[PDB]
């Protein structure tokens, strides 16, 4: 809800410093502390980075003592009537520790579990909360809520270390720009017009049910994330097995050649809000998915290259959406962070948003093209 928009003021005005990731939902900024691993799942796109999900478990246990302190202070004031706090942790007793305790060999639980589903695992560095309880326009916001954090990835076959500098290539188990954008979405759009037209139909009818129910969509997620098991999943109930009805045969077996692409956009849709899961769910029924479409295309090109500061200039109403507060496109951009205004320039763009926007670039050229 509100949540989200705060955390956007705070990162705006930060200039994204030293890539502050920020937290998406209230019942996961909770989990959010120092010494908190997360999990990110295996490398989506390159134009996204996926959500780093909690495992809601500590450190001190995973290695053999299951015993340090955060470096407090940097208060970093209000933001403008919400003045926020933060923690940090020196690498002298990142390197101390590392060296005073060694790795708990026997440890397979989860362990074996990430190798075997190979995902990477991050360790929270730094946190960002508040030594204030702030409500305002209402929600109940508690003391120490978390608003920001910082990653360091380690790696475990061998030996642990620790990852300051979040390399992509390293993971913890063992192409271009818009024009780039254009290929990639284009490429797999075309796999997509592959299957009979019916059947597109009705996972087009399927999906709209699902993106007013976020619940449903992440149970999809779990079904088929990462586990692409031998075994045919079992579907569920509701428009996400209206869906993976659509994704099977007779059997029940999955093909990865039309899966790759419905993880695809579930990543894509997993970046997005739930507000613009709802209209997109409106966009679809009433078959304007085009419009935004062309103009986020358009405003991406123009935006090129991103990450940098500069006031875009087209305006929407020329190209055919209508304007005003309250309109899906407008509302749309909100959400993914962007400011608008009444009169010129009609549009700030900042770097914060670079993720997102993509995403629904994508999730708007995918449904156009089934439509």
Known sequence: SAFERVVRRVV?????????????????????QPYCLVVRKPSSSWFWKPRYKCVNLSIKDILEPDAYDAMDGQIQGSVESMNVYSLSVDPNTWQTLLHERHLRQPEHKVLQQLRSRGDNVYVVTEVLQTQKEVEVTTVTIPSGSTLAFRVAQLVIDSDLDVLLFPDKKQRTFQTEDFQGLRAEVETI????????????????????????????????????????????????????????????????????????????????LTMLSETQHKLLAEALESQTLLGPLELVGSLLEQSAPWQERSTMSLPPGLLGN??????????????????????????????????????????????????
């Open 12 to 32: 705006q005005e930060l200039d994204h410093g030293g890539e502050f990731i920020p937290v998406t939902s209230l019942q996961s900024s909770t989990g959010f």
């Open 189 to 268: 759009s075309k796999e997509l017009e592959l299957l009979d037209r019916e059947l597109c139909q009705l996972l087009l009818e399927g999906l709209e049910g699902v993106l007013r129910d976020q619940l449903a969509l992440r149970a999809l997620e779990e079904a088929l994330e990462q586990g692409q098991s031998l075994g045919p999943v079992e579907p569920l109930d509701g428009p996400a097995g209206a869906v993976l009805e659509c994704l099977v045969l007779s059997s029940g077996m999955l093909v990865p050649e039309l899966a790759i692409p419905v993880v695809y956009l579930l990543g894509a």
């Open 322 to 371: 209508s304007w005003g507060e309250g309109a899906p496109a407008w509302v749309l951009l909100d959400e993914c962070g962007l400011e608008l205004g009444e009169d010129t320039p009609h549009v700030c763009w900042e770097p914060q948003a670079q993720g997102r926007m993509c995403a629904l670039y994508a999730s708007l050229a995918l449904l156009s093209g089934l439509s």
